[PDB]
Amino acid sequence: KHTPINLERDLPQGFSALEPLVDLPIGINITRFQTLLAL
Amino acid sequence: GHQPYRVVVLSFELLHAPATVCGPKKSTNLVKNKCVNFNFNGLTGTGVLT
Ligand SMILES: *[C@@H]1O[C@H](CO)[C@@H](O)[C@H](O)[C@H]1NC(C)=O
């Protein structure tokens, strides 16, 4: 979900449900995850 | 018996994974306002469609 946020530091108060995007039929066991950046 | 022959072999397999490979499935017409059977992409039943 991509929603507008007021100019604030902390997470806002309220409700915003998250619509689904995709499900993938992979069937691989997962134990760890990371993140990627652009430089 | 000595002329060239082209051969193709097809193999299949199953395991603990989603199928993700299936053949065609055909759709009939759509009727309304009649007590009819229906199979709408996996759910079955009987009733009147409006
Ligand atoms: C993923 O790893 C776990 C822990 O080693 C194992 O129990 C599970 O069978 C694995 N999943 C496979 C092989 O699909």
The minimum CA-CA distance between A37 and chain B, rounded to whole Å, is: 32
Resolution (A): 3.2
CA dist B44 and B40 (Å) reads 7
Structure determined by: cryo-EM
Query: Chain A, 1-39: which have a CB under 8 Å from a chain B CB?
Result: 25-27
Contact B49, B33 (CB under 8 A): yes
Contact B1, B13 (CB under 8 A): no
Report DSSP state, residue A11.
P
Structure tokens that stand for B20 in this block: 């993700």
Tell whether B14 is within 8 A of chain A (Cβ): no
Query: Distance from B20 to chain A by nearest Cα, in Å?
Result: 7
- Residue B26 CA to ligand 1 center (angstroms) comes to 38
